[PDB]
């Protein structure tokens, strides 16, 4: 598994909410078990989860945010 | 010896001795590569200067007295030069920069001449006046540099590079990684017909590389490396360029070719605000400063009988009218000169020449023997007339005949405006004679400074400054060429030679000297300009009539016709070369056009029956609308009843582009602005005539000097001038080698071969947009039909120098003088106070002035709380906002210290500081909201801080997302910089800047109306060109993106031209009619065949647009400066 904030397709960030319950379900949908808030500098607020396999992605930096 | 020193100091002979000393030392400094023969002349010069310094010291004759006579600011210069001479004499070590310091002596001329030192002293004060406005303009230039940085950071690095990165190069080093993609500029694409890398862009607007070439950022550097928008230094350079308009069309075209056409909005904000308004307020503060400065202060019977006989001859001269008409006829006669005159016509011209010489000799003799020889010794007018007589006589037994034209000037007696131009040319060396002398001394100093500092480098590094291995057309090795470089810089063309000098010498020194000459030279040129300016001063009939009157007076009808003319204008705008591509809209717009004709002729008949032919035709705009509807009705009736497609069918319908002209009749702004324009045509016309005659002089001179000497015979294999000395010597020689048709003897597009083509070349020279190839082919010219030698006739540059001076610096001076005169006259005749404002615009002017009252409300109420009272008392001190502004300036500097591909850790740290700064600003915002209670509603700068705080908090999140399909999303942080205006208001020292910016706010609506009329003019002319100049061959200024093939492209070209920029480059592909450039029949998407332009309509279009846009923008400047004078 890879540990980090969860991106938005393709190379972006997802978005957090004022609570650990916002994105827990999001980790369940892409293959995440844990869930709480997160912060990606330069791209903004996301939600951090763990136990994320390599089939899903994380916050990858460098190219752009493109969806 | 003390008294001797004093009595020789106050003596006036040794002062002129020193003068001649400095002047001969000047003639020696201006000499390059001097012989060792001179190595002792410098010793003599040091001897004389040291003698003078001695005389001074002895003349005071003490220790503190010698300290008093070296206390003088100027005498430090003499001390420094003598000690530097003693340095380079006694000891070596040798850096070659001390030999340059010899130019410092040329400044001693300012100390020895009486008013010279006073002039320079009074000039330095102008810099002390310009301090705050210079802070203002560097602030705006830095802001806009940040904007253009975040916008096009590393965008000019885009290159049309061949596609690469094929397969498994272990890892990616496969090209047949960055090593090749950078060292492969031969694998870049150069703009066709030039030597310039072809930019491109991701966006779906910018340039489009052809097949086999892809868009990337793997560009070594910009053109020479000095235009990139990254690295905020370079961006500040580029925007100083855009503010001085120097070659700004080049950066404009490059950027729009790389990023995308949408950014013409950025460039037009810069041009219309940065260039236009900031340059105008620089000029206005200089003008206000100089205004304050000017405010700071044989037998007796036979003898008597023949005397009475010549007196009886004298009583009836009746010659002034006849002699004047003979003068006019002589000018008209010499004007009939051209390139290919037949031998009998040359004989007739020379016969008339001799005839007029005889006539004026007869007049001179009759005058000297008839009235008085001593009077013709006295009266300077007749003196100069007799001088012209002697000169003509010397001519009759090249420039020999070129003195005849001086006879034109006696028309000044009956022509008050030509006499005003004479007044100006005289005051140039009169009351402003010492100012012109300051200018000449400065140009000399700078020419020799540049030649010393740069001649060795220019001569040794020629290989990297010129393609065909020779000298460059502009350098500083000689002194003539250095004078030419300084002249160019004085005219406004410095970036294109500063690039050369920096590619030869080095960034630091070259930048320093070229910026210095730019600033100082343009300052003294502006001072001379402004000084000259300020010195020159049954029943159903009436039933239906009532119904129709109600209709025409019904507001809904008027708004309907407004909507209709706007829709028609759009219909015009839909007339690109892609109508065959879309068949539906063809017929849709056909029906639309018929509907427009019908509704407008119906409005015509309605206005007819409502107001009657008399009260209708008594007005002007209705006459205009009548003309347009008449054109449309002729078009319609010719389209219906055949008899068309042979005469003025389309050749006549293109006047449809006059349709938008109905707008001005109705929009309250366009109407008043045009009323201000036409109301000055009787004053632009006489001055246009004065300029026409004064340029007729120079055009006849150019026919004398150059006619026929411009043809250049280039082979089709190359593309530029064949061999200087050999290969094809004469036109009669190049034809002898045309055994293969590769070679053509073609004139240069714009030449001196008539008085008309002479007028064209004079306009191109006087606008400084095109005068490069004029001067090049003119100086290269040696023989009447022989190939032009690469730099022969070099001193014919003096023709264009003297022209540029008189025909531009003085004709434009006359232009602006009479315009100020006519407008100051209009100001009193006008029922209102100031022109260019409608009633509603006037109302908004008054309301904004009532807003701009510096009386605030009550300071603050008390929170009555101990803790809140403490926070309020600590928050409401001046030092707190000083800390806040220090934070925002530190944020500015944080936003100056980033570039492209800077460093990943650097991006991380910069983002961290961004978040840290928005945190500090949220903190100050919440603390000010908790000051007492009323930050949310008290002051406007506070609510500005509030809204920018909100938007910044919103920022980062969507800033992640909107980098693409949008500009840089960090750009919105630049708005925070606008808060410095608060402390700009709350400081006490710099206060004129406040009134300056408020005057800009005051002049915004006038500029809005004038720019609206200018937009309408661009609209009309863009439709005119889209009809006319579409399909024109793509050449110097008309690219594959800047074009007339659509309305976007036409608006782009029209905008770039609006500032006179590059209009020579747009004209030059219009004019070329015929091979090899042009071709015969061509299959165009439209029936009109021929990829050429009509020279007649082309010159008409471009010249008339240049002049109209010139007048419009000068009235823009007028509104700006009249507001600046009202606030004065
Ligand atoms: C309009 C003003 C024209 C001023 C330019 C006159 C050009 C005279 C000229 O070229 O002489 C130049 C001599 O310079 C001077 O005489 C300095 C004049 C002060 C040529 O210098 P060189 O080629 O290095 O030997
Ligand atoms: C007053 C205007 C007088 C103009 C004038 O006299 O020019 C005469 C003819 O002028 C013209 O008609 C050409 C265009 C005139 C425009 C005005 C003589 O010129 P030319 O070269 O000998 O004629 C050869 C036929 N192409
Ligand atoms: C006020 C005076 C400020 C003087 C500023 C001197 C700056 C000179 C910088 C310099 O290094 O000049 C170097 C040598 O310059 C010199 O020979 C000294 C010139 C002395 C000028 C005397 C002052 C002019 C009087 C007005 C060459 O530049 P580089 O470093 O090779 O350029 C390479 C850049 N890629
Ligand atoms: C007067 C002011 C003279 C200021 C001279 C500053 C010295 C500049 C020397 C220098 O090298 O700065 C270079 C930057 O200087 C520039 O390019 C332009 C500087 C803008 C000055 C123009 C200000 C206009 C004043 C109104 C550094 O370039 P680089 O990115 O490191 O690339 C190096 C090889 N291409
Ligand atoms: C107060 C007067 C306000 C002026 C209001 C409208 C001006 C009418 C401009 C005609 C618009 C032409 C439409 C057009 O260019 O479509 C052809 C497509 O053109 C374009 O691609 C963009 C044109 C930008 C609109 C220019 C305004
Ligand atoms: C306030 C009211 C503002 C409006 C005032 C005056 C507007 C006058 C507009 C005149 C426009 C005439 C320009 C024009 O196109 O005439 C063109 C004249 O044709 C020529 O060759 C001109 C010959 C040179 C004569 C020099 C003076 C031109 C006289 C015409 C004005 C015809 O265009 P085209 O070649 O048929 O193009 C068809 C291609 N599809
Ligand atoms: C506003 C006035 C602009 C008047 C432009 C009329 C030029 C018509 C083009 C023409 O007749 O020359 C066509 C042939 O071109 C030539 O050979 C001579 C061109 C004469 C251009 C005259 C330009 C006048 C400049 C105005 C100076 C202010 C026909
Ligand atoms: C305080 C200012 C020190 C700026 C030093 C920042 C270190 C980066 C080097 C640098 O100057 O950035 C370079 C450009 O930075 C600047 O131009 C800063 C100019 C500050 C001048 C205003 C002083 C008042 C490009 O990298
Ligand atoms: C125009 O748009 C295209 C499509 O997005 C851009 O294509 C991609 O551009 C990047 C550079 O900006 C190319 O290089 C890549 O760089 C990364 C980081 O070094 C590296 O990991 C990659 O392996 C690759 O080298 C990328 O190859 C390219 N995409 C493709 C499919 O070729 C293009 O850059 C845009 N052009 C401009 C001037 O903006
Ligand atoms: C134009 O240039 C030609 C080329 O020099 C000259 O005509 C003669 O050319 C031959 C070719 O070598 C020379 O030997 C002659 O000396 C040239 N004539 C003279 C008088 O020198 C001449 O300068 C020009 N000819 C014409 C017809 O304009
Ligand atoms: C050299 O010969 C070529 C062709 O033999 C000339 O080109 C012609 O130039 C005229 C000038 O208007 C055109 O009308 C013709 O169409 C051109 N013919 C072509 C392109 O095949 C060329 O002008 C000649 N050069 C000289 C100096 O006489
Ligand atoms: C975009 C554009 O103008 N491209 C042209 C190209 O079509 C032409 O072939 C070439 C000259 O050979 O000049 C360039």
Residue numbers in the entry:
A (entry chain B): 1 to 67
B (entry chain A): 121 to 212, 214 to 297, 304 to 424, 699 to 798, 806 to 945, 1190 to 1780
Quoted passage from the original study:
Eukaryotic voltage-gated sodium (NaV) channels generate the inward sodium current that is responsible for initiating and propagating action potentials in nerve and muscle. Eukaryotic NaV channels contain four homologous, nonidentical domains composed of six transmembrane segments (S1–S6), organized into a voltage-sensing module (VS, S1–S4) and a pore module (PM, S5–S6) with two intervening pore helices (P1 and P2). A triple hydrophobic motif, Ile-Phe-Met (IFM), located in the DIII–DIV linker, serves as the fast inactivation gate. Because of their high affinity and specificity, scorpion toxins are used widely to study the structure and function of NaV channels. α-Scorpion toxins bind to the voltage sensor (VS) in domain IV (DIV), which is important for triggering fast inactivation.
In this work, we elucidate the molecular mechanisms of voltage-sensor trapping and block of fast inactivation by α-scorpion toxins in the context of a functional native toxin–receptor complex by determining the cryo-EM structure of rat cardiac sodium channel NaV1.5 in complex with the α-scorpion toxin LqhIII at 3.3 Å resolution. Strong density specifically localized near the extracellular side of DIV-VS shows that there is only one LqhIII molecule bound to rNaV1.5C (purple), as expected from previous biochemical studies of scorpion toxin binding to sodium channels. Remarkably, LqhIII uses these two flexible regions to bind to the extracellular side of DIV-VS by wedging its β2β3 loop and C-terminus into the aqueous cleft formed by the S1–S2 and S3–S4 helical hairpins. At the C-terminus of LqhIII, Glu63 interacts with the Asn329-linked glycan from DI-PM, and Lys64 dips into the aqueous cleft and interacts with Gln1615. Mutagenesis studies mapping Neurotoxin Receptor Site 3 revealed a negatively charged residue in the extracellular S3-S4 linker that is conserved among NaV channels and is critical for α-scorpion toxin binding. In agreement with those studies, the conserved negatively charged residue Asp1612 at an equivalent position in NaV1.5 mediates this crucial interaction with the bound toxin. His43 and His15 wrap around Asp1612 like pincers forming a hydrogen bond (~2.5 Å) and a potential salt bridge (~4.0 Å), respectively. Remarkably, LqhIII binding drives DIV-S4 approximately two helical turns inward to form an intermediate, partially activated structure. Importantly, in the toxin-bound intermediate-activated state-reported here, R1–R4 adopts a 310-helix conformation, with the last helical turn of the S4 segment relaxing R5 into alpha-helical form. To reach the intermediate-activated state (blue) from the fully activated state (grey), S4 of DIV-VS moves inward ∼11 Å and pushes the DIV S4–S5 linker inward ∼4.6 Å through the formation of an elbow-like bend.
